[PDB]
Amino acid sequence: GISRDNWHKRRKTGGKRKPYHKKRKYELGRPAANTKIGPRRIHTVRVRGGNKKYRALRLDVGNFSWGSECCTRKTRIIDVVYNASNNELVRTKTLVKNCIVLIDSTPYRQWYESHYALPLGRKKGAKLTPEEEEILNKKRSKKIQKKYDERKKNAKISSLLEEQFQQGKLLACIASRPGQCGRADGYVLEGKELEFYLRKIKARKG
Amino acid sequence: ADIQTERAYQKQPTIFQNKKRVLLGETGKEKLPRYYKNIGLGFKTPKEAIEGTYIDKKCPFTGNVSIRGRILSGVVTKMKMQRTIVIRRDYLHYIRKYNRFEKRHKNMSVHLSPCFRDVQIGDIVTVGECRPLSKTVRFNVLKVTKAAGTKKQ
Amino acid sequence: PVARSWVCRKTYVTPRRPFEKSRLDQELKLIGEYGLRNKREVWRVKFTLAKIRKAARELLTL
Amino acid sequence: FPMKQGVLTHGRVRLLLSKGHSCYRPRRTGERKRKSVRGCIVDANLSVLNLVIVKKGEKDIPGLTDTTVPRRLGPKRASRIRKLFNLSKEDDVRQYVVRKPLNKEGKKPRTKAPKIQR
Amino acid sequence: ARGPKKHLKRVAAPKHWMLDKLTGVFAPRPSTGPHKLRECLPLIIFLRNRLKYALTGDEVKKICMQRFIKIDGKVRTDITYPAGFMDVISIDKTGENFRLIYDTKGRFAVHRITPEEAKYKLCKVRKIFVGTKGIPHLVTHDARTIRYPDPLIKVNDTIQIDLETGKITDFIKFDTGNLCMVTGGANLGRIGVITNRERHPGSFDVVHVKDANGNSFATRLSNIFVIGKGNKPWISLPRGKGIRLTIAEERDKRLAAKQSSG
RNA sequence: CGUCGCUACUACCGAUUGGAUGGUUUAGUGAGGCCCUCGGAUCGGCCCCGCCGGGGUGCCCUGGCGGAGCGCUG
RNA sequence: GAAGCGUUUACUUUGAAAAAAUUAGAGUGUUCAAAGCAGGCCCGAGCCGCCUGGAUACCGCAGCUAGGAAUAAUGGAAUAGGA
RNA sequence: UACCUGGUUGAUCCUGCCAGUAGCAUAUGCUUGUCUCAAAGAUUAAGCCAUGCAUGUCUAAGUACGCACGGCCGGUACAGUGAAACUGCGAAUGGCUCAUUAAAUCAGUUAUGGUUCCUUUGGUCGCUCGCCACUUGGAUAACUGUGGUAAUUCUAGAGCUAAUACAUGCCGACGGGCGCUGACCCCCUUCGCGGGGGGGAUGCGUGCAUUUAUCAGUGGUGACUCUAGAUAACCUCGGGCCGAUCGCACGCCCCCCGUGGCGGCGACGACCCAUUCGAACGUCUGCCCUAUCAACUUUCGAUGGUAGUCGCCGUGCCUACCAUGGUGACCACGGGUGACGGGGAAUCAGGGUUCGAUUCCGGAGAGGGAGCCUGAGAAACGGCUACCACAUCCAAGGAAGGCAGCA
Ligand SMILES: [Mg+2]
Ligand SMILES: [Mg+2]
Ligand SMILES: [Mg+2]
Ligand SMILES: [Mg+2]
Ligand SMILES: [Mg+2]
Ligand SMILES: [Mg+2]
Ligand SMILES: [Mg+2]
């Protein structure tokens, strides 16, 4: 079928190479997974040596790490917004290893509230009183307040980042290979990388 | 220019670009750490690769390539490809019947990291074998020496 | 495949030129003296002597 | 040519048949083979039609609804014996197995019981 | 080929098996095991050609299936089991024990040993690493791996396996002045004392070894098997004490033996 | 020595848009396999919920027949 | 005993690594030999078995190692940007 | 054994070829008593093939309710020998041939720190806190019985019956510990404040393997982005492991007792690691003739860069965007080969010249191509699918092929 062989290429000098055998199995290639966004569909494929590979035909959830906060959560995928390799991949909404995607910020917002005890992702406050009022105060003891204001003093978020939190969507770059592992794990953009990808988005449109 | 000249973002994978920079560390552009490694075999890593800013995933010192196998030398012939050059290796082939020799040469496409900044045509470069970097590239420049030069008029 | 050996060699070497009166007479004298059946016996012992001399020459040059 | 369920035609089609589909058994592991088969639709162009009486009529068909033949051999698993005779717990489940007698003319007739598994 | 081979040619067999050409087309392709097939001695040829206990493969199969051979203390019924270097072949029915050791001419010799010496076996470590839960694992030149070794043992050192337990009794550090043995190449089967180890990074390191006669020979590091501390071996050496004699001295030794016997 | 005359032989030119056989190919059609999206001839489970037995004591433990939910599903 | 050579080679010597078979060649009365890889020893019969061999050499060119530095090429300080 | 001899002339010295001479290697002729080895449809046609055989396989240790035999000792699951069949494994080795193939194969060398690896061997297998377990569920063979077709190792319908087949799924170890979450409580500088520390109720995860991201720096390399740690999480329903398996002697504890609990030697089966056999793609150097082949490659990947896809992995292997590169008189590119490569063979001063289809190693192929299933391993052909070319049977509706295996 599809061949990964090197011997069908012209050699370095440009001369035509003649094959000395027909296609072997170990030099095969398989059709691309073309990982779409939607309810999970994973197809198993037997590979060389009897091992197993996972084709992620459709993925709706992902595992993404903040990194700066060392907070890794299982979030959901909204849509692919930019892809460095092929522009057509964005329009067809395919998850590849290096594509960047919009992910839900709800678990990270929840962790931020539960840890730093500071409003984040909230517009003006006093809108979710049965829960936010409890989680912010908890009337906790002297030492517990001493351990909360201890983590408060270094609690800051980049301006490009809390704006995304207000929007409810975070830019994240995949780091796994869907169609090889069957997952769409990744990391949340921050800092110079986020700034650069935002400028790329703006240059593409904006 | 800068190090971001293509559609993707260039970064060393082993280096965390963001360290949660807050008021405890002065935000006066703290330098991001640079990943370098000693390659062994007596080759000293150049200071340009030590303190540079370029990103090259195929650099022997700052990239993800290991030198092993054969270490050989050549003379730079062309300098007209992106981050890779072609060298000429001249040797003698012994023809037994005539009890004599025969000048013949082999070209080699070797990878030139941006750490070696002022290599010119004719200088002698020692390269080391690495994993296949491209279709015809299997070697990586480890050291550069000038060919009776270092004085340009 | 087979477990044969097919290692063999000729034990004699034929003379370069045939029909020399001197060589023919000398070999016939040897045949008559030692009761040999034909010229192949004298040729095989001549070849054995030649091989011995060849090995000795190699050792002498050594 | 036997007729295969799911063809949905009258006539024949050639189908690539894998292990345990129908109308074909594999001579070696992973072997598939293209076989001619008949569609599931019944018509006049047919030799023998297999039919299974699922509902009995008011009368009795001679030679069919009479002379009941047994199953050739009873259950072998302990659980199957248990569900056959409603055993609860340790009620002689070992000896409740059906033991069939066999009577050959040229030998002393004997009764034999199968080994019970699980 | 479309898969692994399972046949061996008689002429393509290792030379030290002393397999002659005429008797058979094939050779006993050793089963996979602790040792490589180029440097292993299969049990079939050990019992048929070295000790002459059996006449053919069927006879040696009967000996093996009657469970008398204990390779490394374990009963092995495989007819083509790879014995390999420094293994104990114990036939308790005859009360005899063999330590498989190369002789002077680089081939395994029938080496009879006492039962009190047959209970331990030296081994050369090959790789040292740390597995899960921080447990030091150590593999040997066999396929034998052990856990919790003394941290003093480094690579290409020697250990003393105690049979029936698979544990360590003692160890030998690889350094200058330790008696060793060459296990491959032109110097295969030679006993000497390590005198020098020169290092070639990215290449095979080369050691210089001097025997009792003072003859100095070099070899690669991977071919070195230390078998004793200082000048005293930890096991009984074969006849000749691993001392290589050139053609002249063995010729006149043969002449002296024949002249004394005649 | 050469033309001319006779006879043999060997290649050469030659209309025939000569012919045949290989090979690499452009353009088009294209069997079959694999993959993807569907598809659902059928084969099962639960909801049984039409009856009866019933049971800690119609408030069933359920064992069957069996309308069948005409649903949820493999 | 750890590190570098006051250049880089070519060359020469040494060592390692270089399948077996084949070739040369060691030993061995195959009845001689081509071959083969065997065989011999005392037995007064208890020899309730002893002594052996199955070497060695060559294996180009290319690659690895350690000595030599004559021959040949190659360079170091000239606007000194020299040690 | 480093060799020459006849032939131009009227005669002579030469150049120079022709012829002679010796081997060996194919055929052929004539002849042929003994004995030991021993090549043998390669050359043309890798052309076509009738027929028969060439790959099957059971131990005490997966499943026997065949009477096909048979001990029954006779009131009992199963004595045993066991056909068949399911299951497991092999069938990817071997054997054959040399068409293809000219830096291709192949030989030496080196790397895989860039990969997979049945099986053997050695590790690991209570490390996880979480109304069947004294053992769960459904089907299917073989078997009885009804057949169809001209036909084949074609099979359908009905009825059972097993697992180490196919699924399902606990207990136990299990007392707890560790890290977060922290109601509160206690000792504190006490004083009108902070206080410096302990215990801790309630929840959340705890093991190996997998996919991310992050921090520090037990062992190891010449060199890891190595191995091992720590944190946050994920962990794919055609979905990883965490024994529902099988034989041999049979024994120990009895207090609570007396009906249960403990037990040895094995076999099989395992996610993972190591080893063994390997395999695959790479590194450097090396190949015959040809210029009446001098410029090739780059639309259609040619040379490189960036990010992906796919693959077992590294790479233009492929895709997208870029740059215009790359190879050549040190012979590129093209063409030919009556070219498989090598170890080797013949000839034998030295140097060389020819031959290597041929039993060993490596490669390729199974009429020509192409595509796949199973499997650790095949682009398998004594496996399958299709086309092209040959070709077998036929009741004309269909069906069956691959001797460059031994004959
Ligand atoms: Mg059972
Ligand atoms: Mg050919
Ligand atoms: Mg050949
Ligand atoms: Mg072959
Ligand atoms: Mg298998
Ligand atoms: Mg093939
Ligand atoms: Mg095929």
Coordinates of C-alpha atoms in Angstrom, one line a residue, chain A residues 48-163:
Chain A
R48 CA 4.4 -4.0 14.1
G49 CA 5.2 -6.5 16.8
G50 CA 1.7 -7.1 17.9
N51 CA 1.5 -3.8 19.8
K52 CA -1.5 -1.4 19.6
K53 CA -2.0 2.1 18.4
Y54 CA -5.0 4.4 19.0
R55 CA -6.6 6.4 16.2
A56 CA -8.4 9.3 17.7
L57 CA -11.1 9.9 15.0
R58 CA -13.0 12.3 17.2
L59 CA -12.0 13.9 20.5
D60 CA -14.1 16.2 22.7
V61 CA -12.1 16.2 26.0
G62 CA -8.4 16.8 26.6
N63 CA -6.0 16.9 29.5
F64 CA -4.1 20.2 29.7
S65 CA -1.5 21.5 32.1
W66 CA -1.3 25.2 33.1
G67 CA 2.4 24.7 33.7
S68 CA 3.0 28.1 35.4
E69 CA 0.6 27.0 38.2
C70 CA 1.5 23.3 37.8
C71 CA -2.3 22.6 37.6
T72 CA -3.3 19.9 35.1
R73 CA -7.0 19.4 34.5
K74 CA -9.3 17.5 32.2
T75 CA -11.0 20.2 30.1
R76 CA -13.0 20.2 26.9
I77 CA -12.1 21.4 23.4
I78 CA -14.0 24.3 21.8
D79 CA -12.4 24.6 18.4
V80 CA -9.0 24.8 16.6
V81 CA -8.1 28.4 15.9
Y82 CA -4.6 28.2 14.4
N83 CA -2.3 25.6 12.9
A84 CA 1.3 26.4 12.0
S85 CA 1.6 23.7 9.3
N86 CA -1.5 24.0 7.2
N87 CA -4.2 26.7 7.1
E88 CA -6.7 24.2 5.7
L89 CA -6.4 22.1 9.0
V90 CA -7.9 25.0 10.9
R91 CA -10.9 25.3 8.6
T92 CA -11.5 21.5 8.7
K93 CA -11.0 21.5 12.5
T94 CA -8.4 18.7 12.9
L95 CA -6.3 18.2 16.0
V96 CA -2.6 17.6 15.3
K97 CA 0.4 17.6 17.6
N98 CA 1.4 21.3 17.4
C99 CA -2.0 22.9 16.6
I100 CA -3.4 25.5 19.1
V101 CA -6.9 25.2 20.3
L102 CA -9.5 26.9 22.5
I103 CA -10.1 25.1 25.7
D104 CA -12.6 25.6 28.5
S105 CA -11.2 27.6 31.5
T106 CA -13.7 26.3 34.0
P107 CA -11.5 23.7 35.9
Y108 CA -8.6 26.2 36.0
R109 CA -10.8 28.9 37.2
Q110 CA -12.2 26.6 39.9
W111 CA -8.7 25.6 41.0
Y112 CA -7.6 29.3 41.1
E113 CA -10.6 30.1 43.3
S114 CA -10.1 27.1 45.6
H115 CA -6.3 27.8 46.0
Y116 CA -5.7 31.5 45.9
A117 CA -9.1 32.4 47.3
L118 CA -9.3 35.4 45.0
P119 CA -11.9 36.3 42.3
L120 CA -10.8 35.3 38.8
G121 CA -12.9 35.0 35.7
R122 CA -15.6 37.1 37.4
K123 CA -16.9 40.4 36.0
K124 CA -18.0 42.4 39.0
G125 CA -18.9 39.8 41.7
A126 CA -22.0 39.2 43.7
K127 CA -23.6 36.9 41.1
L128 CA -22.9 33.3 42.4
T129 CA -23.5 34.0 46.1
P130 CA -24.4 30.4 47.4
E131 CA -20.8 29.3 46.5
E132 CA -18.4 32.2 46.0
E133 CA -19.3 33.8 49.3
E134 CA -18.4 30.5 51.1
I135 CA -15.2 29.7 49.2
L136 CA -13.8 33.2 49.6
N137 CA -14.2 33.6 53.3
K138 CA -14.7 30.2 55.0
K139 CA -14.3 32.2 58.3
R140 CA -11.0 30.2 58.7
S141 CA -8.7 30.3 61.6
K142 CA -5.7 32.5 62.3
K143 CA -3.1 30.1 60.9
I144 CA -5.3 29.3 57.9
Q145 CA -5.5 33.0 57.1
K146 CA -1.8 33.1 57.7
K147 CA -1.3 30.4 55.0
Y148 CA -3.7 32.1 52.6
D149 CA -2.2 35.6 52.7
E150 CA 1.1 33.8 52.4
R151 CA 0.1 32.5 48.9
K152 CA -1.7 35.7 48.2
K153 CA 1.4 37.9 48.0
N154 CA 2.7 36.0 45.0
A155 CA -0.7 35.5 43.3
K156 CA -0.6 37.4 40.0
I157 CA -1.9 36.6 36.5
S158 CA -0.6 37.9 33.2
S159 CA -2.8 40.5 31.7
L160 CA -3.2 38.5 28.5
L161 CA -4.2 35.5 30.7
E162 CA -6.9 36.9 33.0
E163 CA -8.6 38.5 30.0

